[PDB]
Amino acid sequence: THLRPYETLGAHADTMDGVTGTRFSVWAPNARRVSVVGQFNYWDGRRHPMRLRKESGIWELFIPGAHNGQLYKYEMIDANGNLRLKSDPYAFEAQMRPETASLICGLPEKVVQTEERKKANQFDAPISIYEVHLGSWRRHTDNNFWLSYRELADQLVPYAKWMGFTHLELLPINEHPFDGSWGYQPTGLYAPTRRFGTRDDFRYFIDAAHAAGLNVILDWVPGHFPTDDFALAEFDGTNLYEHSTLIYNYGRREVSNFLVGNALYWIERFGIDALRVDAVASMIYRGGRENLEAIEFLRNTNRILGEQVSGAVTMAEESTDFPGVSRPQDMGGLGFWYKWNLGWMHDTLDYMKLDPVYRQYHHDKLTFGILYNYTENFVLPLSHDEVVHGKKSILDRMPGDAWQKFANLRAYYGWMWAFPGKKLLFMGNEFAQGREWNHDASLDWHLLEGGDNWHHGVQRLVRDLNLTYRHHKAMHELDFDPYGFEWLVVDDKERSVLIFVRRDKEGNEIIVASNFTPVPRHDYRFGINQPGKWREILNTDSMHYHGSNAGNGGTVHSDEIASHGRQHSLSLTLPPLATIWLVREAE
CATH class of the missing domain: 2.60.40.10 (Immunoglobulins)
Structure with a gap:
């Protein structure tokens, strides 16, 4: 026990x-x-x-x-x-x-894991996460009051469902004293924040999410020791839970039992499907520099939290490039099923910021992610951490005038959903909020008011991305297997055009082509692997989404014309600032 x-x-x-x-x-x-x-x-x-x-x-x-x-x-x-x-x-x-x-x-009574909830977490399942901060996703009209767990259950869950996301990830619901810490500075590790109702109201919320077919990932902060209200410091008179700012004493048995136990509590008593540890770097450092104690705690937590409740999974955000973060303990260490691809986010965001015209000299920002995609089981993320403290909203990072800004955004999203790695997207990004995230207010749903505008179109694309991503095994079955990805055109730097194929276990492939300049490319020829008829299944330039509606009109047949070292090619129209996905049509 x-x-x-x-x-x-x-x-x-x-x-x-x-x-x-x-x-x-x-x-x-x-x-x-x-x-x-x-x-x-x-x-x-x-x-x-x-x-x-x-x-x-x-x-x-x-x-x-x-x-x-x-x-x-x-x-x-x-x-x-x-x-x-x-x-x-x-x-x-x-x-x-x-x-x-x-x-x-x-x-709370006790939640048994369903075969379906477990399967959603598997490496070969489509995993698209909607990251949310419950005290700022939506606020009541006049009151500007927080929605409750019951209301959130009635509104956030169906929304996440309709939008096509497979998971709901909540920033720390730990009971904490200050709104502004977002929950990463707790005082009650075992009690769901009271801001939205009772622990039973919360339990209900998770239940509702499952009844809607969504797995819930709860941000778990075993790396943040209570620093408020003398909550855990010098308990019993002496440094009971921490070492002699303040940090846990993972070596101390009971302390580890407290943390490991808390991770078992959430999953079994509330039915949580996954726990996510943030700032694992700050836990493993500050071994010369390595806090070999914490590094041992995580490994054990994952080993135990792997034998005790198989089906649940763990993910982690590690700033440095600690080796094997998401690799087996009896080798690398830690042993998280997944790791946040912060590097990819830095490379791709650095690229989208670029003036379309200068992207020919930084082509490597989009192709690099592939060289190390097989080192960790990644989650490509666009989280809350990247749209605060002056970083801006994702939309604001895009260059050019209105149309160009959204088109860049949509083209990016198109690239993200097709690139190797599960997906995570924070609330507000789906409808391209312009302002940075403010945990103290609602999410600017006002932009989506009266009359179809660019914001509606971006929201429409995200959902379409989700539903297309799922459904087609090629886009999510072999993220971690080099057989699932292959370049068709990795070097058209001068035109900023990148094409690659995605492949499932059956060998079926889906073509992914992105044009990163506002120059439309017609009769663009490239080699392909499976000749025959190909049709767009996704086009971020669609009038839907507010694109210029350029593309290939229903079915283009390949030609036996050598290209890119291949025998057989396509020759397509590549819409400006946009990405398309094509599937082969059986005959």
Whole structure:
């Protein structure tokens, strides 16, 4: 039960032979006197003293007439004689602002993983993630109030579903004190933020997401140690959870049990399908420089969180290029199923910013990603971190006038959805919000008001990308197998045209062609592998999406004309600032 401390620690309802109440448990080994304060005790630690246990440093005391709903805390004297109040680190629901108090309640029943939810996480499944920050996706009209978990369930889920995303990724719902930290500075690792309702309201939200066919990825912050409200620092009087700014002591058994246990809690008690660790670099460093303790924690978490609940997966964002981040432990280390391709994002965004005319000298920004795509199982991401603090919105990075800005954006999205790697896109990007993300406001849905505009067209493209991406195995079955990708034209630098093929296990391929200048290319010939009839299945230049509606009109047959070292080629019209996808038509 070291794996599941939360199943015995904290506050749970019991029965001392006909007598019911809730049993408390806290791990403050040193301490020096610890009592249960709360509504039940009229808040008097001088009435319910807990009985220690040196064998496990765990204190405990059963209290009859101590039912759920009752608020409470802990009263103790530091191992150094200091009187203090502590919020149960294993609080499953907490009262943040109001003086900070834990809430008695059970453990959410228990969610069994379905065969379908597991399969959605697999390396050969189409995985398109909609990243959201629950306190700023949408706000109530006049009030400017937060939607609840129930409302979000009624609105965010169906929306994510309709838009074609396979996963919903929530920035930290950990109970945290400041909106502005986005949830990466917690105070309650086991309690869903109260800003949107109850822990049961939240459970409902995940349930709703699954009933809609969506897997939920929860941002997990085992790398951010509580730095607020003296939440975890110098517990029991001494550096209980952290080392002697502040950082966890992953070496300390119980501390690791707390974290590993918390990752098991979310998945089993709430049904979460995946956990994502951020800033793994800051965990593995700051081995000469390597915090070999944390590096060992992650490996174990993934090993355990791989034996205990197979089906769930883990992903991580690692700034440096730590080797094998998403590779087997019995080799590289860490062992995350997936890793965020920050490098790809930096290269492709650096390229889209370029003046179309200068893109011939940085062609390598789009072709490089391929050389190291087989080193990690990547997730191409366009997240919240890239549209804040002056980085701008993705749309604003695009060059040129209106039409050109959107066309660049759409062409980019077209490239992203076809490039090797799963996909992740933060809320607001789908409808090309112009302003940077503001966690303190709604998402500017106003741009999508009255009259079809460019924003509607971009939103229309994202959905089409998602639905086309899924459906065709070629675009998502072999992301991690070199057989799934091959260049048709990797060197047309002077015209900024790049063509490549995607291939599934069956050997069926889909042609991907991108033109990165506003110059339309007609009769553009290139070698192909499977001659016959080819038809566009996606064209970001479509009048739909507000493009100039240029392209190839329903079915172009290849010719036996050598090109690009190949026998047989196509010769197509490559729309300006746009990418198209073609599929072969059986005869």
